[PDB]
Write a protein that binds this ligand. Sequence first.
Ligand code: NA
Length: 368
Amino acid sequence: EKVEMYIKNLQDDSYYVRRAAAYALGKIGDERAVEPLIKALKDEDAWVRRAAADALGQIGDERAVEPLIKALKDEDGWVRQSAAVALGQIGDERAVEPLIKALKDEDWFVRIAAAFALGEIGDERAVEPLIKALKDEDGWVRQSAADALGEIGGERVRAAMEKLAETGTGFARKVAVNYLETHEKVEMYIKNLQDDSMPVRYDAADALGKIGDERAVEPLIKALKDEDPNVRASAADALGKIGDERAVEPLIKALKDEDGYVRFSAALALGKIGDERAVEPLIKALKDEDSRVRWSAAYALGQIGDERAVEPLIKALKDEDWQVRKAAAVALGKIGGERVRAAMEKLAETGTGFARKVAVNYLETHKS
Ligand code: NA
């Protein structure tokens, strides 16, 4: 109930209250706030745009990727660096080519952020752009590319490190020679899913979801019954990114978890997969104790687009939580069947307040 005022305050006229909202959503915000924070990326105030990219990477939702890639072309350097780090935290391979361009940004601190991000994504296409970045005019940028090639650490880098230590000059030689003096991936994290340490398990589910290989589906389904609820919800989000329809039934069981964030993550993942078998469980999830879970129920029903949720969403237009109603109005707009039209004209004349307000709105938009 702290989140929603920050979400409303993101569109406030004053630039200072926008900053305080984006600032606090970077600390508190969850998946409910990326659609408003994606709009905040278009702000007038560079401080707002910066803190927004800061928050979208901290939330780690894959829908911020195409926005943050255009934020890489922002006029403020400190905004481009916040989008670089944010895309590094999301780990989406679509940022690799534009981050390779940011590896040659006019500002030194953006090149550092671009090198870091490509290191955290671990895509091998950055290996030679990072190798040539070892000759950058700025030593701190050279140092960041050395660390970025270390995080990737394929044999493509051992190849380039050997060629560099045999042939290179200056810092690039110092890096490669030390590389030799001190020294596939999806299979390591699957085994890490069964680790005794909780952060290792969590990191494993975080990693397998960004990688997106469907071999990690069955192991992540088993992680849905993990002892810790952070691993449970992480494997749920990972299964949603993977999109494999094998996790549909075990995710529906996750809709009945003790932890509300696990149910919240299970609902969003079932909307990503889009299987209609989620419609019935998600509909009864609109009546959940947790206002977040009620929100993820409506949003997922909007992603699926099944007309069986029309009237449950009309019901949801009178939720106590503000953005649960906001999500329900969005969901009826996505579905938009002939049933939705008939339901909202009844609501236009018989409704009250917010439900009436959005019923009139829907009829206004869908006219031509
Ligand atoms: Na900031």
